[PDB]
Amino acid sequence: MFKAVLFDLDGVITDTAEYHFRAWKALAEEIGINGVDRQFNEQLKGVSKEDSLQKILDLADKKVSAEEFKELAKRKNDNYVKMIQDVSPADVYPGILQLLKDLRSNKIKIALASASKNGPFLLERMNLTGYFDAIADPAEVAASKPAPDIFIAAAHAVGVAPSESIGLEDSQAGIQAIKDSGALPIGVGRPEDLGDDIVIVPDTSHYTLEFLKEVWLQ
């Protein structure tokens, strides 16, 4: 049987994308730029702050100094930290709390493998910290997803090899990272998005201990 489950945070445990979106929209509004909506935000998800801010400035063809660029980036981050003060156990995705309980009661290790710089904070606000054996620190990993580094770090931090683990992700880059780590991916979302070569479930309510066991046995 697998010995650990390695979780991403956004799109598996909870929705942090909402709060990044709100932070960018608030920034864009503060400086009088229109067009930062949920569709435009698809060009901001999972890219650097620099890239994101470039794209936003381009909406109005706005030029900035290096000093102004740095201030705007800081402002977005401050906005984000303010907006996540709201997070509560009400923000946990369906099935996830029961899955953590079941994993823990079956002595399976639980690790977070997220690029979030606020992962410990978020897990504390959602009252999930107690279930986590480790949180991989993205500050201490050399390469982001789709590189396998953060999944290797998460597995190692609970004393297992990635080949002893299942990874749960909703993103192409995350699924690729799990595959290249040696862990078994189980995706959540659409095969159209994540590929035909992995087990995919339509939403997190399908992530049950019994399902993960059956997938492992294949």
Tell the smallest beta-carbon distance from residue 173 to Mg ion (Å): 9
The reply to whether 10 sits near Mg ion by the rule CB under 5 A is yes
Per-residue binder mask for Mg ion (CB under 5 A), 42-61, x = binder: --------------------
The reply to whether 8 sits near Mg ion by the rule CB under 5 A is yes
- Return the range that interacts with Mg ion (CB under 5 A); candidates 95-103, 136-144, 165-173, 207-215: 165-173
CA distance 123 to 129: 5
CA distance 143 to 149: 6
Q: 53 near 28, Cβ under 8 Å?
A: no
Catalytic residues: 8, 10
Tell the smallest beta-carbon distance from residue 123 to Mg ion (Å): 15
- Return the range that interacts with Mg ion (CB under 5 A); candidates 5-13, 49-57, 130-138, 197-205: 5-13
Strands 184-188 and 109-112: unpaired
Find the helix packing angle between 149-157 and 172-181, rounded to 10°.
60
Of 9, 21, 217, nearest in space to 128 by CA = 9
Tell the smallest beta-carbon distance from residue 54 to Mg ion (Å): 23
Gaps in the chain (C to N distance exceeding 2.5 A) after: none
The reply to whether 170 sits near Mg ion by the rule CB under 5 A is yes
The reply to whether 133 sits near Mg ion by the rule CB under 5 A is no
Q: CB-wise, 44 or 57, nearer to Mg ion?
A: 44
The reply to whether 149 sits near Mg ion by the rule CB under 5 A is no
The reply to whether 171 sits near Mg ion by the rule CB under 5 A is yes
Q: Is 88 exposed, middle or buried (0-12, 13-18, 19+ CB in 10 A)?
A: exposed
The reply to whether 14 sits near Mg ion by the rule CB under 5 A is no
